[PDB]
């Protein structure tokens, strides 16, 4: 019956010290975890090399919070194959962020997507609708021709190495929205792609998680865990974790 | 006064690997260079971990490629105090690339340059005209404006921080080739403005560099016109030629 591994992501986003980040990393170290669980810390891209070497629960993976497809001049910009030649392998790609002010476009978004899964990347891709675009009742339309754009680069295999996070930007919600969002996500795939790929995707809730409503969010049927902001900067990002069972 | 202390910048741009920018590091740890002369090498973001722990020549510093001004909610940037507290004190702004790939307008480089500077930075500040604005005699008008925009958010002590690097973008992958005497050229206009509209004590001290292409064969000729501070390099600079680039300065 079961729902396939959940992965708790915490994008620290533009944040953080040495000093700041290296105490999380060891609380998070400290941390007892007793479930399958695929924990995921996105720092930036200046502290990849600290985490990579201090963070050592074997829980935790380390991912980057944007690239770009090569290597070559792009000057300020960072690519794939210096990512996998750095040894990152999970990345978080078009966040609302940089869909917002960074012109990730629903087709950059598909074709880093694409780039990223063929040199073997695992990639969290969100998708999300604004406030207005969803009073105006646009959430489906919004938010499934942004996966479609994704999944127009994508074979069927593909699907093994991507993790969707919706992101519900209206609300920057309820149970029920998140799952009712999940839900349209999920039924959009198994129609689109196929159910041999909708049953096992993990399809993460990016709203505003803390520790104290994660528990009743992942507990929704398609809620298959979270990428979490602000909270994840923080110590109850751990209880955020344990939400996951 | 005769001319101010040359750089010779490093613009790795999105290039390395771990393998390849070692290599390249040892070698510069092992160049002696006689003049004085201030070295810089701006890596991606993810490498300046191990171009701090690394490079230990004396005249070379580390620099970051670009940055915007504050923390936050920024998916994917880096901010100048994430910089700072990592030590990193050099960076290159407004190149031509985020100009034209990745919305560097001339208020926004603006905006970042003043951040830069508040913030205790050196900054090379990077302006230049395409071959569109070149051709309708635009070059003038294009560099001084991008120039006093950055200028506007300055104040004339902040300049001791300011390094300008002249991009003739209109040279690059057009098939046309700047002479050393068209480098002059705009140079000379950037610091006829800077001494009007600044000051001449700061036109003077002020560091311009060219930030055409530049290789071992062609950096001396370049490095002899009155008005070029040093290069800001980009393919040469993944080289060991990079080396003979630096004693082109001389």
């Known amino acids: 019956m079961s729902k396939p591994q959940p992965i708790a992501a915490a994008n620290w986003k533009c944040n953080g010290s040495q000093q700041s980040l ?4 060891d609380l998070f170290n400290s941390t007892s975890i007793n479930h399958d669980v695929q924990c995921v810390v996105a720092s930036t891209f200046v502290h990849l090399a600290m985490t990579k070497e201090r ?21 300020g910009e960072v690519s794939l194959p ?15 962020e940089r869909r917002a002010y960074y ?6 978004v598909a074709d880093k997507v694409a780039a ?14 604004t406030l207005q ?15 479609a754009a994704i999944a127009k680069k994508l074979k069927k295999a593909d699907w093994a190495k991507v993790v969707i996070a919706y992101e519900p930007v209206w609300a920057i919600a309820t149970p029920q929205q998140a799952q ?9 795939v198994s129609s689109k792609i196929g159910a041999d790929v909708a049953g096992e995707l993990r399809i993460l ?26 909270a994840s900067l923080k110590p109850e990002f751990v209880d955020i974790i344990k939400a996951t069972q």
């Open 133 to 147: 675009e969803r009073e105006s009742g646009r959430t489906a339309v919004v938010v499934l021709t942004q996966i």
């Open 103 to 108: 012109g990730d476009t629903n087709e950059i």
């Open 22 to 25: 290296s105490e999380l990393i």
């Open 205 to 230: 809730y990016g709203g505003s998680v803390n520790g104290k409503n994660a528990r009743t969010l992942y507990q929704q049927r398609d809620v298959n865990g979270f990428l979490v902001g602000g």
């Open 116 to 129: 990223a899964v063929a040199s073997g990347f695992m990639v969290i891709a969100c998708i999300g609708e």
């Open 180 to 188: 009712e969002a999940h839900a349209l996500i999920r039924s959009w």
């Open 55 to 75: 963070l050592s629960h074997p829980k935790f993976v380390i991912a980057a919070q944007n690239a770009i497809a090569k290597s070559g001049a792009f000057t």
């Open 82 to 96: 210096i990512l996998k030649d750095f040894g990152v392998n999970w990345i978080v790609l078009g966040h609302s």
